[PDB]
Amino acid sequence: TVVLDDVELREAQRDYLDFLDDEEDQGIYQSKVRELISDNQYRLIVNVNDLRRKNEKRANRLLNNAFEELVAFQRALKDFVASIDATYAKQYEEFYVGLEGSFGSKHVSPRTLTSCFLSCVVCVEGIVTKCSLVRPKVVRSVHYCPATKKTIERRYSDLTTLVAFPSSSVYPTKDEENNPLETEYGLSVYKDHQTITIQEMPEKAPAGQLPRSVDVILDDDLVDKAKPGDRVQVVGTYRCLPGKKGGYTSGTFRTVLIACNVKQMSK
């Protein structure tokens, strides 16, 4: 199926494109988009305080609903940088957003982060404790048939915190007539993948208490942003991971923080 009409998505992309335009009003995001274009970067950073200043209701929708509004945001950024530049937008296939500013009730620590903020955009203080070895996750896998001389390309998607069935995550190993394939690693695409473990900052925790920690997931242009012992502040989406195929569920949903931005101490 393909969606033909969606009032929410259409108005979201309209409002975003309007906000990110910004040329007539002080050129903040015009300057920022031009900067990331010239610097060859594709993860914009966006002041949620300015977003509230311009379109407050959009801001509340963004905060209280993360994945939908962020998908709308990144696609609006795709269209906007497509307008300002053509070959650059063709070269880079998806343009991320990160969030920043003041997040009033959602600026928390790993202790105060309850399930109330599930599927929402939190801003978590606290040190780093773990940093996994950075690994590529396959996202567009190209194969070549030695017998048939034809090249195919299976695709994948970020099913990190959504429903995921085996069909999406199959990886080809045979041709339609039993003619084994050869993968083209270089022609493929990849996305580095790291997982850190934020902990409540050791001073700010109440004394005599075993500290509270929250897992964080990192992707392209965010992996080597914070080593262990970093006084990080991660803005991201707090979500649930699906325990894979069940037949009996305890209802205990593990959680992560898909980081949409990473910062160190401001000093």
Partner 1 sequence: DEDVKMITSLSKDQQIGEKIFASIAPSIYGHEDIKRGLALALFGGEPKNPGGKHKVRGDINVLLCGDPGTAKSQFLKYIEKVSSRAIFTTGQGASAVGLTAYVQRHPVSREWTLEAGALVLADRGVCLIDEFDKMNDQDRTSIHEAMEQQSISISKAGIVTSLQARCTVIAAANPIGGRYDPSLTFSENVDLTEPIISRFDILCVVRDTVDPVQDEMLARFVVGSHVRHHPLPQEVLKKYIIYAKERVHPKLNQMDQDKVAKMYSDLRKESMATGSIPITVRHIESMIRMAEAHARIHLRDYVIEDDVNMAIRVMLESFIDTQKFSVMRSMRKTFARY
Q: 107-108 and 120-124: which strand pairing?
A: parallel
Tell me how far apart the alpha carbons of residues 119 and 220 are, in angstroms, rounded to a whole number: 21
Task: Tell me which residues touch partner 1 (CB under 8 A).
Answer: 207-210
Q: What angle do CA 172, 173, 179 make, to 5 degrees?
A: 120
Tell me how far apart the alpha carbons of residues 74 and 69 are, in angstroms, rounded to a whole number: 9
CB of 205 to partner 1, least distance (A): 11
Task: Specify the residue, 104 or 208, whose C-beta has the smaller distance to partner 1.
Answer: 208
Task: Specify the residue, 186 or 202, whose C-beta has the smaller distance to partner 1.
Answer: 202
Task: Specify the residue, 114 or 209, whose C-beta has the smaller distance to partner 1.
Answer: 209
Task: Specify the residue, 208 or 251, whose C-beta has the smaller distance to partner 1.
Answer: 208
Q: Which residue type is seen at 105? A: S
Q: 151-155 and 135-144: which strand pairing?
A: antiparallel
Task: Specify the residue, 209 or 252, whose C-beta has the smaller distance to partner 1.
Answer: 209
Looking at the DSSP bridge assignments, the partners of residue 236 are: 122, 259
What the block records as the tokens of 227 is 């080593």
Chain-centre distance for alpha carbon 50: 21
Coil/strand/helix, residue 130: strand
What the block records as the tokens of 111 is 């202790």
Q: How many CB atoms lie within 10 A of CB 123?
A: 22
CB of 216 to partner 1, least distance (A): 24
Q: 151-155 and 182-199: which strand pairing?
A: unpaired
Task: Specify the residue, 212 or 263, whose C-beta has the smaller distance to partner 1.
Answer: 212
